[PDB]
Amino acid sequence: FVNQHLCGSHLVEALYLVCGERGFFYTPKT
Amino acid sequence: FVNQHLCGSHLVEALYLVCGERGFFYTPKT
Amino acid sequence: FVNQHLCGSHLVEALYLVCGERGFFYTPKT
Amino acid sequence: FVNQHLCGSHLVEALYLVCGERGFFYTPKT
Amino acid sequence: FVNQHLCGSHLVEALYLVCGERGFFYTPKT
Amino acid sequence: FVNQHLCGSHLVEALYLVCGERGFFYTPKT
Amino acid sequence: GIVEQCCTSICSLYQLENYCN
Amino acid sequence: GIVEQCCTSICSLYQLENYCN
Amino acid sequence: GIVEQCCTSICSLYQLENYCN
Amino acid sequence: GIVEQCCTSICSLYQLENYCN
Amino acid sequence: GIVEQCCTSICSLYQLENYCN
Amino acid sequence: GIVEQCCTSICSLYQLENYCN
């Protein structure tokens, strides 16, 4: 696989991709 | 706003738009 | 909800989200 | 170009790409 | 990573994320 | 149609749009 | 209309072009 | 849950808002 | 226009509704 | 092929990786 | 390449077809 | 956070998994 800049909606779409059924949290404030 | 029919990654996009800087958690069943 | 920068295709995807069945116009020239 | 099968937000994306700076109107039935 | 259910443009997005700078080829049947 | 800047995932989504069943290659290294 | 046509059947980019401003 | 509801039926942006941090 | 309102400067989902039909 | 497999069944990111240049 | 053609500098949908198989 | 990790600086798909539940 690769390392890339994933931002905004693309970041959460990548999280969706990677995590899928596990689910995920997107917490930009940290 | 209108009701939404959102599957897969479209739900994540919608959560992203709705939550902005707050972020969100995505938690499918199973 | 939040305020964010929505640009390009993301802008129209947000319009789709918000307006849905109502439809919308995307008129970047104004 | 090829014919398209476009539902939901994919149609909006396609309209966005097709129309560019002209923008477009999205007008579903009902 | 989780298994994926990817149709249409979602497969292309997934290929894009997976392949990064390598790029990829998209070759549907027929 | 128009000329626009198509980048990243948007570029490959546009390729998908234009090429569809033909398929395409996305080869950013050239 | 186009929104339905593109979903329940198929549509061309040329038909889509009609919807540009 | 919301992920299923939004897919197999419909959901509002207001219901979605519940899932923000 | 919308691009100035949303893209160039932040807008809300309510302000987005300004562009619904 | 992969395009169909990923749609009509499931596919892994590892199978997708095969399609990178 | 495509990135130079489209991303860095504007391209048309026709120029995009250059990258179809 | 994730934005720093991925958006501001490059991250891998493995590092993305850090944010799965």
Ligand SMILES: [Cl-]
């Ligand atoms: Cl972007």
Ligand SMILES: [Cl-]
């Ligand atoms: Cl879909």
Ligand SMILES: [Zn+2]
């Ligand atoms: Zn984008």
Ligand SMILES: [Zn+2]
């Ligand atoms: Zn979709």
